Amino acid sequence: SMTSHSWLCDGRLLCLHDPSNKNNWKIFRECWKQGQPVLVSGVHKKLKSELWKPEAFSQEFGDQDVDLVNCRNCAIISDVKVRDFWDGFEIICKRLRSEDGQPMVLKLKDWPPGEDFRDMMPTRFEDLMENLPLPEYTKRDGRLNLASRLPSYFVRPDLGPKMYNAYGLITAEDRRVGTTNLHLDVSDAVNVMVYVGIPIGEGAHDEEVLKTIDEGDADEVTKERIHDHKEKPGALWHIYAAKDAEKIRELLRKVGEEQGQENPPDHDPIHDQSWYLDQTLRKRLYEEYGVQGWAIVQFLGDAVFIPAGAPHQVHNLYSCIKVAEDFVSPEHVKHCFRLT
Numbered sequence: 001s002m003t004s005h006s007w008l009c010d011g012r013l014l015c016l017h018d019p020s021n022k023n024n025w026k027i028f029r030e031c032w033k034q035g036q037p038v039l040v041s042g043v044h045k046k047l048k049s050e051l052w053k054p055e056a057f058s059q060e061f062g063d064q065d066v067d068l069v070n071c072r073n074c075a076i077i078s079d080v081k082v083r084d085f086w087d088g089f090e091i092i093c094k095r096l097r098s099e100d101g102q103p104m105v106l107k108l109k110d111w112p113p114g115e116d117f118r119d120m121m122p123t124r125f126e127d128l129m130e131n132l133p134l135p136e137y138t139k140r141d142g143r144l145n146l147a148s149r150l151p152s153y154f155v156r157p158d159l160g161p162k163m164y165n166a167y168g169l170i171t172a173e174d175r176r177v178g179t180t181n182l183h184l185d186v187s188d189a190v191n192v193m194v195y196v197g198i199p200i201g202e203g204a205h206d207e208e209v210l211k212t213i214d215e216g217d218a219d220e221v222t223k224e225r226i227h228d229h230k231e232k233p234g235a236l237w238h239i240y241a242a243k244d245a246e247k248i249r250e251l252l253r254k255v256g257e258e259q260g261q262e263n264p265p266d267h268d269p270i271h272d273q274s275w276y277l278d279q280t281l282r283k284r285l286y287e288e289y290g291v292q293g294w295a296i297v298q299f300l301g302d303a304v305f306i307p308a309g310a311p312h313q314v315h316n317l318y319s320c321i322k323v324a325e326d327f328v329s330p331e332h333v334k335h336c337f338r339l340t
């Protein structure tokens with residue numbers, strides 16, 4: 001039967017089921033005030049699916065110049081055409097190859113660039129902004145979004161949204177790599193999975209995806225969305241409470257020293273955006289520092305709410321198109337204040 005919500009991460013994560021329900025705020029706001037992330041499913045059913053396909057982005061914008069990142073080694077591929085990324089999104093025999101002759105796992109950097117999403121893609125902008133969940137928090141002029149209402153004593157987010165496009169990580173060695181490394185934001189954010197591309201060529205890659213989710217610490221109910229409902233999984237997230245950020249910095253300073261990095265005692269390994277917490281590091285954070293996180297699988301049409309100050313990392317299972325909007329809730333405005 002249809003219900004309003006469920007609890008994932010062994011009861012520790014709210015999952016809303018109706019993205020446009022006028023009463024969602026009554027369930028949301030208590031979890032949000034406690035500094036927890038929230039998942040909202042079903043946003044893909046509200047969108048115009050023809051606007052969010054890789055072949056359309058290639059046809060309309062393919063002649064623009066961009067830089068890519070090689071996810072495996074962080075090498076920058078400079079000044080290529082954006083069609084060279086899009087045409088390899090799902091079809092493995094079209095991907096740029098490294099010198100070993102293997103197809104690369106690539107991330108499309110800063111595209112559309114800076115604040116240009118609205119100017120470059122006005123119809124996509126309308127379709128996304130009109131269908132964001134919790135609109136009093138997430139719309140540019142929502143009553144509970146302080147972004148447009150704060151003086152210069154607060155760090156204000158750029159004008160959004162921002163698009164995040166990258167291929168899926170494939171191999172057993174790839175399990176230790178991030179799509180986006182561990183970092184934090186001083187604003188709140190909502191991140192929507194608008195498209196998941198499951199390839200063909202090296203298609204039959206189902207098995208390494210299940211081992212990644214299982215070793216990723218995903219709960220038993222999350223494993224049921226695959227086997228029972230056949231939903232498309234996009235990306236594995238780990239999110240940590242804002243209150244645990246300094247304990248994470250202590251672990252990463254100790255590990256940086258063990259690995260012969262030579263860092264001053266005060267340097268900030270989260271701001272550096274240079275670490276991915278693999279199974280070994282996540283277990284060491286729990287056992288040695290007492291810190292538990294949330295392991296979240298973001299399926300097609302899931303919106304992940306990330307609280308200001310919360311350290312988080314992202315590992316794509318398949319090729320993903322994500323679109324994110326920043327906002328400033330009253331619950332978490334302390335995180336962007338420039339004094340004390």
Ligand SMILES: CC(C)(CO)NC(=O)Nc1ccc(Cl)cc1
Nearest residue numbers: 002003004018021022023024026
């Ligand atoms: C039978 C329906 C309406 C179909 O979606 N399911 C619900 O109960 N939805 C619901 C979601 C949020 C709130 Cl706050 C209230 C109700």
Ligand SMILES: [Cl-]
Nearest residue numbers: 035242309332
């Ligand atoms: Cl907080």
Ligand SMILES: [Cl-]
Nearest residue numbers: 121122123124
């Ligand atoms: Cl458009």
Ligand SMILES: [Cl-]
Nearest residue numbers: 025134135136
């Ligand atoms: Cl709302």
Ligand SMILES: [Cl-]
Nearest residue numbers: 179180181273
């Ligand atoms: Cl990164």
Ligand SMILES: [Mn+2]
Nearest residue numbers: 183184185312
């Ligand atoms: Mn982020």
